[PDB]
Structure 1
Amino acid sequence: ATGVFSPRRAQIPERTLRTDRWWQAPLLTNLGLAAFVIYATIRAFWGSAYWVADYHYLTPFYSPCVSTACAPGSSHFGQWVGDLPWFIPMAFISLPFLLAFRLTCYYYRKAYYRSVWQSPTACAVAEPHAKYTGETRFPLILQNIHRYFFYAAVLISLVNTYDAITAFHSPSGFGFGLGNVILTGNVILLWVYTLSCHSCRHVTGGRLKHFSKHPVRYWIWTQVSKLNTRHMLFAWITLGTLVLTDFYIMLVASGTISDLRFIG
């Protein structure tokens, strides 16, 4: 047959000889990705419970609010485009770019190539596909533009940082109070995940031949490499923090109390 049943290889009539639970990691990856995508696509399109008009909380799923249909006070950069026809999310500016950034990620690519595309489900288990072209043909040659969604992600992280910074306002001046803690932790972890990127590691100093000739970029490359050794952790961590932040803000906008340290 095809790949390990070829006539010249050892005659084992087995898809794999592994005796462990090798199908557990793809299943967990599928469940996590599916849960996140379902939650994000429901919340981004709900169209409500995203803005606390008192303590100025805004969900990352509504980061730049550029419509005149937004809750008065929500737009931090101006209201540009009218009202939208119910199938364009209220954050149509940033959510496409974040989805593209996480889609063309060197880690997420491994995850869903193993899980969805059944390119190797496990390490040494016979692939179900007969022909394979890798990232050489058309639709998958476009994964090399990750380095531009990286710049987009830098800009979106700057927008999120501005929002989290101005979210420190109680009605009677400055404020604190656990919405700020969650928003700030979410932003910091987004920054960490963005700076863990392999394209960041390449653009800062990974493309140099002589490190001794560049003292600053060598330092930056060292730190970014230490961060990048755990790029897999931060992807899931930031998915979880996004979910938790959006959930807490939705609960506070619709109904619960906000646990503040400065008066209202």
Structure 2
Amino acid sequence: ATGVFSPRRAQIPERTLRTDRWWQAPLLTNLGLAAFVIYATIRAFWGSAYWVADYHYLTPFYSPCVSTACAPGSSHFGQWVGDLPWFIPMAFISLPFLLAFRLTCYYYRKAYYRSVWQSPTACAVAEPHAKYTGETRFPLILQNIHRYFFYAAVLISLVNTYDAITAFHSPSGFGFGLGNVILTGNVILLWVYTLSCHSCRHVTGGRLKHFSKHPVRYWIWTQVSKLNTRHMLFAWITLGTLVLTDFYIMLVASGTISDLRFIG
């Protein structure tokens, strides 16, 4: 055949000789990704139960809310575009950019190249593909623009930070109600994930040659590298925290007590 069944390579007629469960991690990746995608799509297109008027709670999945069909008070940057027809999500400004940012992420590329595309399914298991070009041809060569989605993600993180800051509200001014805790934790973890990005590491000081003549960027690069060593973990953690933030906010909007600390 092609890869390990080539004429000059040692005659082993077994696809792999591994005796462990090398297929366990791809399954976990696939179920996690599928669960997040399903939940995110359904909740983003639901179109309701996303805003608490009393405590100014807004789901990140609806965060830039720029339509006149939106709940009163949800538009923090004005109302720009009419009414949406059942297939434009209320957060159509940011959802494409966040989806592209996580689709071009270096970690996520590893995850789905292993899991969906079976590029390596596992490390020493032979491919179900006969030809392979990698990221050299037209579709996959576009993964090299990830830094621009990183810039967009920085802007969207600023928008979410504004949302979290304005969430500290009560019907009598200032308020603190565990929705603030969930939102603030989610925003902090999103910032950690955004700042542990491989493109951030390159842009800050990764592309420099002499760290000795750039003391500030050397320090920034050192801290960003320390964060980047845990980049796999922060992606999954932020997926989870996004899901829980949405779920809690939806529960409160539909109906449930907020567990306020400064009652309003």
Q: Same fold (TM over 0.5)?
A: yes
Q: What are the Cα deviations for residues 127-146 of structure 1, in whole angstroms up to 9, with x where unaligned?
A: 00000000000000000000
SS in 1 for 2:131: coil
SS in 2 for 1:136: coil
For residues 158 and 172 of structure 2, the distance between their equivalents in structure 1, rounded to whole angstroms, comes to 27
Tell me the matched-pair count: 264
CA deviation vs aligned residue, 1:113-153 (integer Å, no higher than 9, x gap): 00000100000001000000000000000000000000000
2:148 is matched with 148
Q: CA deviation at 1:61?
A: 0.2
SS of residue matched to 1:146: helix
**C-alpha offsets along residues 78-113 of structure 1, whole Å, 9 cap, x if unaligned?**
000000111000000000000000000000000000
Residue 197 (structure 1) shift: 0.2
Per-residue CA shift, 1:4-39, capped at 9, x if unaligned? 000000000000000000000000000000000000
Cα distance in 2, alignment partners of residues 66 and 49 from structure 1? 16
* Aligned partner of residue 120 in structure 2, secondary structure: coil
TM-score by length of 1: 1.00
Partner SS, residue 75 of structure 1: coil
Structure 1: gaps of 5 or more residues:
none
Q: Which 4+ runs in 1 deviate beyond 2 A?
A: none
Task: Work out the CA distance in 2 between the residues paired with 1:185 and 1:249.
Answer: 14
Q: Helix, strand or coil for the counterpart of 1:113?
A: helix
Provide the rounded CA distance (Å) in 1 between the counterparts of 2:63 and 2:213.
41
Distance 2:186 2:114 in 1: 28
1:73 is displaced (CA, Å) by 0.4
The percentage of aligned residue pairs carrying the same residue is 100
Query: SS at 2:202's partner residue?
Result: helix
In structure 1, C-alpha distance between the alignment counterparts of 2:154 and 2:177, rounded to whole Å: 27
Alpha-carbon distance in 2 for matches of 1:50, 1:170: 17
| TM-score, normalised via structure 2 length | 1.00
CA distance in 2, matches of 1:121, 1:8: 24
Residue 177 (structure 1) shift: 1.1
- Secondary structure in 2 matching 1:169: coil
* Residue 236 of structure 1: how far off its partner (Å): 0.0
Partner of 2:50: 50
Task: Report the 3-state secondary structure (helix = DSSP H, G, I; strand = E; otherwise coil) of the residue aligned with 1:123.
Answer: coil
Q: Distance in 2 between matches of 1:97 and 1:86?
A: 20
What is the CA–CA distance in structure 2 between the aligned matches of 1:263 and 1:114, rounded to whole Å? Answer: 50
RMSD, matched Cα: 0.3
Partner of 2:223: 223
Deviation per residue, 1:182-229 (Å, 9 max, x gap): 000000000000000000000000000000000000000000000000
Shift of the alpha carbon at 1:252?
0.2
Q: Give the superposition deviation at 1:260.
A: 0.2
Residue 263 (structure 1) shift:
1.7
Instruction: Give 1:247 shift.
Output: 0.1
Q: How much does 1:173 deviate?
A: 1.1
Q: Which residue of 1 aligns with 2:194?
A: 194
